[PDB]
Design a protein around this ligand. Structure first.
Ligand SMILES: C[C@](O)(CN(C1CC1)S(=O)(=O)c1ccc(O)cc1)c1ccccc1
Ligand SMILES: C[C@](O)(CN(C1CC1)S(=O)(=O)c1ccc(O)cc1)c1ccccc1
Lengths: 219, 221
């Protein structure tokens, strides 16, 4: 379903999820899992609201969402913390830092990775419109197959457009494109270490069963 | 340290290239895979050192980088080595594997499928040799003195943007193709991770030679 890149960015602007509005050992585990669940509900809705997503296979829709909920959640946290150095804005109410993450053993390294990546995004001077395309691509590339390639190339065109609209040379444009794209490897990296810890906490019972993200964690 | 033109970098990468390696069961075939990996790794360290600016990096960094991507750089090599042979994986000339012989090892066939699917995705984009070299090098430099690395990466990025330009296409089709191969690298890393997960649940006998080679990096050579 063909449309202009400017239009795709606007529908992605609208599709955006509402802001979820919410120290000891287990208290922060259930606060984070509470937020992750509430946010996941919004993600599925957000994902469905992406043009062409619901036209995709039932298998594909699930396999995609399954393989990136963690990353899309982290990318969201990265944008929330972009203009707050040394802080991770999980929710506008519940804000945490490096010296706050020391509560649980093993959870320190992930907060460091997230902050380091947020920093790299801050240095990059990442725009809102640039970010939206990035999040959608994170979801569509975390893998009908041809319909997906089309939907991805659409958000790729939508990102190439936002990068052109900033007003810079063909070299500085392409360089900036590749910059954020290679910075996504670092988001996925942090997402994997988070999944290895999340699945380990499920197999430790420090985090509750609760809802939805329990359904996500299994498959 | 360098203000070397992108064409000259693409050339250094071409000169730096390792010699291809030439070395039916389920474990001695898996032993063949680990034997091939260990010897190709020797060439990789050499190749890595031969990249401009790499040896100027922290020796700790040099090892950390090589540690986090030997598997991926090896797999990227296999996909270039398989680009023009649909349905097969040219590991070595004397070791060609395909869909018909991965079922023998526990969850190895899954990796083969991923590897073939990605190779397919690379032939559909008609990936050039010069495009591949920049990609391989970036895989290594981005798998993470830190400032020197960002410079070296931006250099290979410029070297890739240049080969993308030299093919002669519109500014939209240029940027679209850049992002295409860059997003296809996520799929290479994905397959790499699956492979590392397998290797980690295997006996230590297998990871030891990798680590011994990586710590052999204490020069001269
Ligand atoms: C601290 C955290 O990064 C939290 N996350 C996991 C519980 C879902 S989370 O996915 O990073 C996350 C990110 C943003 C949010 O608004 C909500 C959650 C983490 C990672 C691994 C293991 C435990 C917690
Ligand atoms: C099937 C395979 O993908 C083989 N690999 C290494 C263990 C040998 S490998 O890393 O994928 C590989 C890649 C390129 C080569 O030229 C040779 C090997 C694998 C990966 C991890 C664990 C076990 C086997």
């Amino acid at each position: 379903d063909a449309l202009s890149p400017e239009q795709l960015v606007l529908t992605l602007l609208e599709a955006e999820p509402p802001h979820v509005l919410i120290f000891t050992e287990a208290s922060m585990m259930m606060s984070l899992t509470k937020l992750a669940d509430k946010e996941l509900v919004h993600m599925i809705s957000w994902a469905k609201k992406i043009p062409g997503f619901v036209e995709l296979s039932l298998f594909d829709q699930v396999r995609l969402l399954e393989s990136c909920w963690m990353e899309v959640l982290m990318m969201g946290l990265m944008w929330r913390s972009i203009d707050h150095p040394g802080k991770l804005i999980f929710a506008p109410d519940l804000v945490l830092d490096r010296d706050e993450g020391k509560c649980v053993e093993g959870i320190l390294e992930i907060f460091d990775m997230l902050l380091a990546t947020t920093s790299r995004f801050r240095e990059l001077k990442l725009q809102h419109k640039e970010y939206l395309c990035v999040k959608a691509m994170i979801l569509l590339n975390s893998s009908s197959s041809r319909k997906l390639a089309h939907l991805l190339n659409a958000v790729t065109d939508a990102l190439v457009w936002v990068i052109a609209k900033s007003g810079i040379s063909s070299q500085q444009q392409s360089m900036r494109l590749a910059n954020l794209l290679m910075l996504l490897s670092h988001v996925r990296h942090a997402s994997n270490k988070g999944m290895e810890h999340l699945l380990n906490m499920k197999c430790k019972n420090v985090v509750p069963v609760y809802d939805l993200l329990l359904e996500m964690l299994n498959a």
